[PDB]
Amino acid sequence: TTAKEEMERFWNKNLGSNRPLSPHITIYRWSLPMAMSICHRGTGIALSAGVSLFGLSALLLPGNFESHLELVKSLCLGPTLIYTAKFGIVFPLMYHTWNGIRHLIWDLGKGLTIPQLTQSGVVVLILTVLSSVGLAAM
Amino acid sequence: STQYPVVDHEFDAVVVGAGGAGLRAAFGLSEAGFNTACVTKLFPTRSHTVAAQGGINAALGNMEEDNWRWHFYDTVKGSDWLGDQDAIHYMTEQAPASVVELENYGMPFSRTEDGKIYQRAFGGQSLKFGKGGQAHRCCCVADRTGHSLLHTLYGRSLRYDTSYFVEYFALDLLMENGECRGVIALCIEDGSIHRIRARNTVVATGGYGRTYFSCTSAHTSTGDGTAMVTRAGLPCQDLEFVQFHPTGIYGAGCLITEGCRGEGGILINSQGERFMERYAPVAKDLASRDVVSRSMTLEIREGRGCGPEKDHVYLQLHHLPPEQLAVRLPGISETAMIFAGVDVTKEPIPVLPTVHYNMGGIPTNYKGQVLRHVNGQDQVVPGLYACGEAACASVHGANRLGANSLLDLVVFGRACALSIAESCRPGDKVPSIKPNAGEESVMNLDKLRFANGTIRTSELRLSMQKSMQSHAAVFRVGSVLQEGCEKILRLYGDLQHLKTFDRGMVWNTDLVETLELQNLMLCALQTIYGAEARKESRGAHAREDFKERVDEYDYSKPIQGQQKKPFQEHWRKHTLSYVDVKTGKVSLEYRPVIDKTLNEADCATVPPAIRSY
Amino acid sequence: SSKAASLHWTGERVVSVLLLGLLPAAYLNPCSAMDYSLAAALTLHGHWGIGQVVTDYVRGDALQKAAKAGLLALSAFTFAGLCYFNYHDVGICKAVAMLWKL
Amino acid sequence: PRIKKFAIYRWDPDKTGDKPHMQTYEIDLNNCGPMVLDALIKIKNEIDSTLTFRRSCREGICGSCAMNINGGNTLACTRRIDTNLDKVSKIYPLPHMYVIKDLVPDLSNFYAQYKSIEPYLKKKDESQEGKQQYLQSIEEREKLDGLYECILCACCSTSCPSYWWNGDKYLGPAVLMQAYRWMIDSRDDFTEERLAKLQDPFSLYRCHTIMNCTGTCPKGLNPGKAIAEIKKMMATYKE
Ligand SMILES: *Cc1cc2c(cc1C)nc1c(=O)[nH]c(=O)nc-1n2C[C@H](O)[C@H](O)[C@H](O)COP(=O)(O)OP(=O)(O)OC[C@H]1O[C@@H](n2cnc3c(N)ncnc32)[C@H](O)[C@@H]1O
Ligand code: HEM
Ligand SMILES: O=C(Nc1ccccc1)c1ccccc1I
Ligand code: SF4
Ligand code: F3S
Ligand code: FES
């Protein structure tokens, strides 16, 4: 029996058996670092989708960008409502920008103790709300 | 029968046990080129030796210049001259060789200025044959040595083609006309029964602490190999000698290492007195285990109790440097806090002497061959070996020296491999076994699995445990031992009035713990009867009736003027206990210790002397 | 025994620090050259991003190849779009600026 | 009388039709020990002798106890019971693992991965081995602290979400930490080829510093940090 053969025979044993996989998301305790990793994935997917929607409209949809903005003004929405549209753009952008630095700090092998994840984690979370409210006010 | 499937395996050599003893024997056999199968009920890491904290002895001369012969003397003196010196010679000489082997396997030993394996003072070790003061030969991985030892031995065992039967409860030895053929084992995973046969069989199952109510050992230290030897009719040795480690948490009974006493730790009573200086003058609180804990159990019965209920004592690390505690002993720093809530830096640890090491086990050669006692002489059982706490070469004698058992593990595990390697080659025909062999072992399983009784396993285990705890304790008198002997005999007849519940095949922990109870009881019977039969005080076994050390001579005065006491009239001999399985009767015999060494000119025999550190 | 999987990881961190540097540089200096390099880093980083998600969730030999192909065609068409937007329209920087004062 | 409720996952493969379900046990805490396992042992011995689990030392060094109590992967002998009687303690088997029976997981693959990294000392020419102790400075010894202590309880690897999804191909923290444990071991000569063994998207690069491993470790170690330190070596090694 070898290492590779052990795994190879582990899978045959279980996948053809009436054994149940134990609960995981149903039961495992939610923590800030774990939940904040979920949001980083979400915001990444959310952002790239937006960027793709922007490119795949430059090649596909008619007109120019100035014509498109003049079509947004057609709805002449409330200044608060246009601020809400603006805030929902920067919020997922900023979170990912701040937490992205936190990931890059980690990659340097720095700030990887359990207290530090809740410290810098809040510091990312707080920087987010501030830089999003800050940028939407321009 | 026929309700069960049989799967007969064929191998060169079987090793029953995945501790340090078992692993070293297992992979060592594979290294010699043998088709070796290791049969273990636990995963190798989970094996107890992982709990070992103190260290591993070897006269490497890393702290001060040292001779392995000095280590020889200290082991035999500690054995209260029940230690067979042919085995001690072999162990103490291979000691440096075997340790340097482990450091080369990759065992992360602590280091010093020189970059050599850090050694430190330990329980009852001296230089210049007991004259040169304190000896520093305990090589350690800073309070987690057995953990590293087991992990590196296991780690290195993946280099070879050893077939690991992980989570397999071995039931009985495959036996035919005295000759051992291997083992019959239950596969915990699916309930199946497997007959693993070989030309040789190594038995390294470790001790049987769980016979008593309070021990330091694992829940799985159930003397299973001892029972397999028992049920084969083959004798057990010195099973009444049970080590009481002086320091263990008053609560759940977890261990606080003797390394605490070697690094500068002192034991404090109810008045705050350095009370070990009152008994031992030369070694003080770093004396032999058979005397230190017996001085402690004395203090409990005095009325000088040191606790909320005046039942336990203290181990003090109040005056120890906090800088040293972080480096040398971090494993006790956590476990004292978790099991008691004790800051090892500010507060003293509440300690109580409880069961730790089983001296006896399976009679064995210095080479490691299991012995039956025929015609008042010795006979090597063919293809049967034993090593570790499971065995009894009696390299420890009446009292095991501190940090020698992990050495005992490596050395004699290794020895078992060499004995097989030299006596026969791999590919030698495996002796074939009967079609209806180990048939009663399966029936012992089946009858127990569908057991309609009245006293469930858990209840009977406790009845055995607390009995041993008050009868076969630190001190023992004839009257108390006599009650204990028929009290333990009582519960053997109860071993059919037992009610089991779980009646499945896959992982019946209910069934295996009951099989463990049969093995624990078979251990218990021989343990208590040997103590009642022995009418002297020797090492760990101390009779209050006969506090005299009875030898072939009165070794207090010169040897010349006396005539030798007849062998059947003195008590310097090995207890050979047998027990009938059906009646539960403990009939026992005796055989002499070995005094001659492997070479007199290289290592002199140490004649019996006065016993006090 | 070439080390390709390690270099890919290093590459991903390199574009991250480049894209981190670009977002303030594009604010301070919003030029046509900044438009293209922003389109270059943005599409690449995201492509390697979703790539990580695909290797994580999309199990199976046959299904994973199609997902990687889909992601490649998507990223190609995205980078093409952004470059077309930089060349034949206002350009990312100036388009973002216009969108903001609205 | 101080009664505490325990909700425990139970599935018996020796009963046809029986599917996964919870079972509650009531226990007086003044009769019982302070640790979770003490309660698991108490109900096994007194209430229901079918609760099949793994236990050995009850000391926190063997790693049998590994299970998910109240959403966290720790040792049952290290987690002390919540004296809060208003709360019911939930005992579960280690997350996303094939249940053999009641809280007993199939760790075969987990061990099998550990075998693949070769957790033993490797010297380029060990024809002189066995006879002389290898030299190592006190400083080079500290480089191993926080790494060897790992008892392979499989709490950390089983807490990682990447190991939940890609357990087949990704090694997980437990195994990866030991890979590092042997990487900076000064005695080992095979440091370059050990890193080259991780040159694929799955073996090492399924880590995304989710950090559940460090957070759940019963022995207090930091597997993630050691993984992060591997990644750095993987980028900055010649040849
Ligand atoms: C209890 C204890 C002992 C101890 C110690 C600390 C504690 C808490 N610290 C020590 C130390 O610092 N230095 C030292 O020299 N000794 C120390 N000790 C004593 C020593 O550790 C033990 O005597 C020794 O480790 C015993 O090891 P051994 O290899 O002989 O046995 P094991 O560790 O208990 O492993 C047993 C293996 O056998 C298998 N087994 C048991 N029964 C079966 C059956 N039924 N079928 C199949 N396999 C079986 C187990 O699976 C296990 O792997
Ligand atoms: C300039 C600010 C940004 C920084 C610092 C940054 C950095 C990072 C890093 C380091 C990761 C990998 C996380 C890890 O270490 O495992 C990541 C993930 C990702 N990012 Fe960015 N990024 C930024 C902007 C963006 C933008 C604008 C987009 C949209 C086009 C984007 C899309 C993604 C995607 C799709 C992932 C994959 C999610 C994952 O693997 O978990 N990022 N980011
Ligand atoms: O799998 C992930 N989701 C997940 C995390 C926790 C619980 C459930 C799902 C995840 C999230 C972020 C980064 C990488 C990953 I592999
Ligand atoms: S690093 Fe900690 S949590 Fe992970 S396997 Fe080792 S002991 Fe368990
Ligand atoms: S929980 Fe995770 S993804 Fe990496 S940091 Fe730990 S293994
Ligand atoms: S049983 Fe050994 S760690 Fe809990």
Side-chain angles (χ1 to χ4, degrees):
Chain A
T1 168
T2 64
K4 200 166 194 165
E5 283 177 33
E6 272 176 42
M7 300 162 71
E8 219 276 324
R9 286 172 167 178
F10 162 92
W11 290 109
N12 284 234
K13 197 204 287 170
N14 289 298
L15 294 158
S17 77
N18 47 246
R19 278 183 186 162
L21 279 160
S22 51
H24 36 305
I25 35 254
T26 320
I27 49 97
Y28 204 87
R29 199 184 181 184
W30 301 108
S31 55
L32 175 91
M34 194 213 303
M36 278 188 74
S37 198
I38 292 169
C39 296
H40 192 82
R41 260 272 176 80
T43 53
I45 292 158
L47 262 52
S48 282
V51 176
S52 284
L53 259 80
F54 197 80
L56 272 67
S57 52
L59 295 174
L60 293 177
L61 294 176
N64 73 317
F65 191 73
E66 301 200 43
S67 164
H68 284 84
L69 285 182
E70 289 286 291
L71 204 65
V72 180
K73 304 167 190 289
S74 306
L75 295 154
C76 50
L77 309 164
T80 322
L81 194 69
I82 212 85
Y83 177 90
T84 309
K86 189 142 66 184
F87 181 79
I89 288 292
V90 208
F91 194 78
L93 180 278
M94 280 317 204
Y95 174 85
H96 189 89
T97 310
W98 297 126
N99 192 210
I101 306 164
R102 194 165 75 113
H103 266 97
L104 291 181
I105 287 173
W106 296 337
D107 296 342
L108 263 77
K110 312 200 85 65
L112 282 158
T113 63
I114 284 308
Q116 280 175 307
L117 273 37
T118 320
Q119 271 182 339
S120 62
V122 171
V123 175
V124 161
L125 220 77
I126 289 298
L127 269 177
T128 298
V129 198
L130 293 170
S131 65
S132 293
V133 166
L135 271 198
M138 287 175 69
Chain B
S1 305
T2 322
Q3 203 77 19
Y4 297 98
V6 283
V7 178
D8 292 28
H9 303 265
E10 191 174 333
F11 284 92
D12 277 327
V14 181
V15 182
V16 184
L23 255 35
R24 184 66 189 93
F27 92 87
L29 266 156
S30 296
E31 195 176 299
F34 289 83
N35 193 184
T36 317
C38 187
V39 187
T40 172
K41 69 176 178 185
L42 301 154
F43 182 82
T45 289
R46 323 276 179 251
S47 308
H48 198 50
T49 87
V50 82
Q53 293 180 129
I56 205 273
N57 297 327
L60 285 169
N62 290 3
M63 306 297 103
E64 71 278 351
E65 41 210 57
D66 202 1
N67 193 322
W68 64 266
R69 291 155 191 92
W70 300 340
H71 183 226
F72 159 83
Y73 170 84
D74 277 285
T75 312
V76 62
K77 187 197 173 185
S79 76
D80 215 15
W81 287 268
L82 200 82
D84 302 63
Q85 305 190 16
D86 69 331
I88 306 172
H89 181 138
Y90 182 72
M91 190 194 73
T92 56
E93 190 183 4
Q94 196 73 35
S98 282
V99 168
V100 167
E101 213 173 65
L102 299 164
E103 198 281 318
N104 290 17
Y105 293 143
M107 188 176 170
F109 280 108
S110 293
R111 310 279 159 156
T112 39
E113 199 86 294
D114 295 22
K116 286 182 176 192
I117 299 154
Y118 166 86
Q119 308 173 128
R120 206 50 174 84
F122 222 76
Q125 282 172 114
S126 59
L127 297 167
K128 306 221 167 195
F129 303 99
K131 305 283 175 173
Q134 187 62 243
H136 302 71
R137 67 169 75 94
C138 185
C139 310
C140 66
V141 182
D143 198 33
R144 280 184 281 251
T145 90
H147 172 265
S148 274
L149 176 55
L150 193 54
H151 271 273
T152 44
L153 279 168
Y154 171 79
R156 228 266 191 155
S157 81
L158 288 332
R159 221 169 180 172
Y160 306 90
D161 53 295
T162 311
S163 304
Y164 284 93
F165 288 76
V166 200
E167 296 179 331
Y168 268 75
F169 197 93
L171 302 155
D172 277 288
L173 259 33
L174 278 162
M175 212 70 73
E176 179 182 306
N177 306 317
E179 299 185 293
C180 190
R181 305 292 164 83
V183 285
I184 181 165
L186 158 75
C187 184
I188 314 161
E189 207 210 62
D190 64 340
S192 57
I193 289 154
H194 302 256
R195 286 156 68 184
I196 309 152
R197 68 184 193 93
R199 209 174 200 273
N200 293 283
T201 313
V202 174
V203 183
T205 60
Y208 55 97
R210 290 289 155 172
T211 43
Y212 293 79
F213 176 70
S214 194
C215 82
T216 54
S217 58
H219 284 280
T220 42
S221 303
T222 50
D224 302 323
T226 325
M228 296 165 92
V229 175
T230 290
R231 289 184 294 265
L234 304 158
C236 295
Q237 215 184 59
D238 304 321
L239 290 191
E240 76 270 22
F241 295 93
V242 169
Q243 196 172 66
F244 284 83
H245 188 115
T247 52
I249 296 100
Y250 165 71
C254 295
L255 183 85
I256 308 137
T257 176
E258 191 164 57
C260 301
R261 287 174 275 165
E263 291 277 350
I266 313 297
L267 292 92
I268 269 82
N269 55 20
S270 59
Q271 207 173 322
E273 192 193 326
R274 191 174 191 173
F275 82 107
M276 278 307 301
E277 206 165 306
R278 202 170 174 175
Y279 309 99
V282 190
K284 296 179 190 187
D285 41 57
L286 200 54
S288 293
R289 297 210 229 261
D290 66 318
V291 186
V292 176
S293 60
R294 208 145 56 86
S295 302
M296 288 182 72
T297 314
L298 199 73
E299 282 281 315
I300 306 160
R301 300 290 174 183
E302 295 287 79
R304 305 159 193 178
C306 340
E309 207 181 307
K310 281 198 168 187
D311 48 15
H312 64 267
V313 192
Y314 293 115
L315 208 192
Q316 200 160 306
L317 301 163
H318 189 90
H319 47 239
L320 273 298
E323 317 283 328
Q324 194 186 46
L325 267 159
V327 187
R328 294 303 154 205
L329 307 166
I332 51 136
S333 298
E334 274 197 298
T335 50
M337 174 60 73
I338 295 158
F339 286 92
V342 171
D343 284 292
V344 297
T345 173
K346 280 185 177 177
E347 304 287 339
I349 342 280
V351 298
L352 174 76
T354 53
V355 174
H356 186 88
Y357 186 84
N358 279 114
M359 318 287 193
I362 316 150
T364 207
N365 286 140
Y366 80 84
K367 281 195 174 183
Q369 291 146 133
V370 172
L371 295 148
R372 68 171 85 94
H373 192 67
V374 174
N375 194 219
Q377 289 151 298
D378 290 2
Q379 198 181 154
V380 172
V381 181
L384 186 57
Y385 290 83
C387 49
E389 192 172 343
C392 189
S394 211
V395 70
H396 306 285
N399 177 250
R400 164 178 153 264
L401 207 64
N404 263 6
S405 188
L406 289 177
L407 180 65
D408 178 29
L409 258 46
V410 174
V411 174
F412 285 93
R414 172 199 208 261
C416 280
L418 286 145
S419 279
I420 297 160
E422 286 168 359
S423 62
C424 64
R425 285 278 78 199
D428 279 325
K429 201 175 186 177
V430 199
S432 56
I433 194 72
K434 312 153 181 287
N436 300 312
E439 203 169 30
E440 274 224 7
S441 310
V442 172
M443 287 178 74
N444 184 233
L445 198 282
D446 195 23
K447 201 91 167 178
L448 208 61
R449 188 263 208 88
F450 293 113
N452 273 176
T454 163
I455 313 156
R456 68 208 313 250
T457 303
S458 46
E459 290 181 355
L460 191 46
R461 198 200 296 106
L462 186 70
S463 291
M464 173 195 71
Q465 281 181 208
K466 279 212 279 285
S467 277
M468 293 291 295
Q469 198 68 15
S470 58
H471 295 96
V474 189
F475 293 97
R476 35 198 160 203
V477 308
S479 305
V480 175
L481 287 164
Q482 263 277 280
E483 190 185 24
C485 279
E486 48 217 51
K487 211 162 191 172
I488 292 295
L489 175 77
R490 159 193 269 93
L491 311 160
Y492 198 88
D494 298 337
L495 282 165
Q496 29 224 299
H497 286 272
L498 25 66
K499 184 89 207 297
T500 191
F501 276 70
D502 192 332
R503 277 162 173 81
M505 290 263 73
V506 173
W507 271 84
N508 200 307
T509 42
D510 193 20
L511 183 54
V512 282
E513 288 187 46
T514 315
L515 292 158
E516 280 180 355
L517 177 65
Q518 294 173 150
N519 300 358
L520 283 168
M521 278 295 304
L522 278 162
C523 277
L525 258 78
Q526 306 182 58
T527 306
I528 190 80
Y529 272 74
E532 103 95 45
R534 185 170 293 271
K535 298 187 174 187
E536 71 150 342
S537 286
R538 188 174 295 266
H541 178 264
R543 292 269 284 209
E544 292 267 44
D545 335 299
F546 316 95
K547 53 262 290 286
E548 280 296 288
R549 228 277 303 275
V550 187
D551 305 302
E552 351 93 56
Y553 293 90
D554 190 51
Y555 276 95
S556 55
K557 49 168 277 188
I559 182 74
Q560 186 187 312
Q562 310 154 324
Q563 198 178 312
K564 211 164 201 174
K565 293 176 197 169
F567 173 77
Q568 41 181 302
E569 206 175 322
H570 73 265
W571 278 113
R572 197 170 149 272
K573 56 194 187 179
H574 289 313
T575 313
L576 285 158
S577 54
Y578 306 76
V579 48
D580 194 332
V581 196
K582 198 152 198 168
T583 59
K585 190 180 189 169
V586 195
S587 54
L588 41 137
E589 302 152 18
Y590 300 93
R591 76 179 190 92
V593 301
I594 299 160
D595 286 347
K596 64 151 195 194
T597 62
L598 270 157
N599 204 118
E600 177 65 39
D602 201 56
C603 189
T605 298
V606 177
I610 319 160
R611 179 70 172 151
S612 53
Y613 267 92
Chain C
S1 190
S2 170
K3 60 169 204 167
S6 68
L7 283 170
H8 182 268
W9 185 92
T10 315
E12 287 176 315
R13 316 295 112 154
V14 168
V15 294
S16 289
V17 299
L18 199 68
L19 197 65
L20 185 75
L22 282 172
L23 298 192
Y27 175 91
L28 301 170
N29 176 46
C31 68
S32 186
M34 198 70 81
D35 261 341
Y36 283 103
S37 66
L38 188 60
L42 214 61
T43 42
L44 216 196
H45 169 88
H47 174 73
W48 280 340
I50 309 297
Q52 295 286 349
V53 194
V54 167
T55 48
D56 269 299
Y57 298 97
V58 191
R59 309 304 291 172
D61 209 40
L63 219 162
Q64 200 182 325
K65 190 192 172 173
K68 284 280 179 65
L71 164 70
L72 187 79
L74 218 172
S75 305
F77 267 107
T78 306
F79 183 65
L82 295 179
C83 288
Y84 176 82
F85 190 87
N86 286 343
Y87 193 59
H88 287 274
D89 214 341
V90 214
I92 309 163
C93 283
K94 186 59 191 164
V96 162
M98 285 170 68
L99 179 70
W100 227 239
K101 40 192 170 185
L102 196 145
Chain D
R2 273 147 64 178
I3 307 157
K4 173 81 177 194
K5 299 168 185 174
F6 290 95
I8 309 163
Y9 178 94
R10 289 266 274 108
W11 176 76
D12 176 53
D14 294 305
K15 189 183 175 186
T16 326
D18 187 32
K19 67 160 169 280
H21 66 297
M22 302 298 287
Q23 201 172 351
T24 325
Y25 303 100
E26 51 179 52
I27 283 302
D28 186 302
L29 293 180
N30 297 31
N31 296 115
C32 197
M35 306 301 149
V36 172
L37 183 72
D38 297 3
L40 295 160
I41 275 289
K42 193 184 184 69
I43 78 102
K44 172 71 175 174
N45 285 317
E46 300 166 4
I47 308 300
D48 182 15
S49 56
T50 318
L51 202 91
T52 301
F53 49 83
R54 287 189 168 106
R55 88 287 179 272
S56 195
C57 66
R58 58 98 170 90
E59 201 173 359
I61 32 78
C62 83
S64 282
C65 289
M67 55 183 73
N68 183 287
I69 322 285
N70 308 317
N73 299 329
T74 55
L75 307 160
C77 62
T78 299
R79 179 63 83 268
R80 47 173 63 95
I81 315 165
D82 195 11
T83 45
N84 203 163
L85 306 164
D86 300 75
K87 293 179 183 183
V88 46
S89 281
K90 281 172 171 57
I91 293 92
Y92 277 95
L94 292 170
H96 198 288
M97 290 268 81
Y98 289 111
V99 182
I100 303 176
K101 182 183 180 176
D102 321 326
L103 318 172
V104 176
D106 197 313
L107 300 154
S108 309
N109 182 80
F110 171 81
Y111 298 134
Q113 294 171 132
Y114 178 61
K115 188 178 194 169
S116 72
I117 67 154
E118 303 178 63
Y120 40 82
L121 215 173
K122 288 205 281 173
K123 289 274 201 176
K124 293 279 179 175
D125 189 301
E126 24 94 319
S127 65
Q128 282 291 333
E129 83 152 32
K131 56 171 73 185
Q132 269 299 325
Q133 55 183 315
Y134 304 142
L135 290 168
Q136 186 173 66
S137 70
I138 56 156
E139 191 176 37
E140 280 164 23
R141 178 58 187 89
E142 284 159 304
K143 281 188 172 189
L144 300 166
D145 279 324
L147 291 155
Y148 74 97
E149 297 92 321
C150 171
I151 77 268
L152 312 166
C153 64
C155 282
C156 60
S157 277
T158 217
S159 75
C160 181
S162 266
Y163 197 88
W164 288 346
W165 320 136
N166 321 313
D168 44 19
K169 300 190 77 185
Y170 169 57
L171 296 178
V175 189
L176 266 168
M177 213 211 191
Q178 293 314 292
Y180 190 67
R181 192 254 95 152
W182 287 104
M183 272 158 185
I184 81 296
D185 198 316
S186 66
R187 297 168 287 176
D188 202 72
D189 284 336
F190 276 58
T191 324
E192 188 179 297
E193 37 270 286
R194 274 175 195 275
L195 293 160
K197 212 172 202 67
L198 298 162
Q199 286 297 334
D200 66 283
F202 285 88
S203 292
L204 161 71
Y205 296 116
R206 248 38 275 176
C207 179
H208 308 305
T209 50
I210 301 161
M211 280 277 95
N212 278 326
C213 52
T214 307
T216 207
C217 173
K219 281 281 273 180
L221 320 161
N222 195 166
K225 159 78 175 177
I227 295 168
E229 219 79 17
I230 292 164
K231 293 181 177 180
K232 296 201 287 181
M233 291 185 72
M234 292 282 289
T236 53
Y237 82 102
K238 283 259 199 172
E239 194 171 34

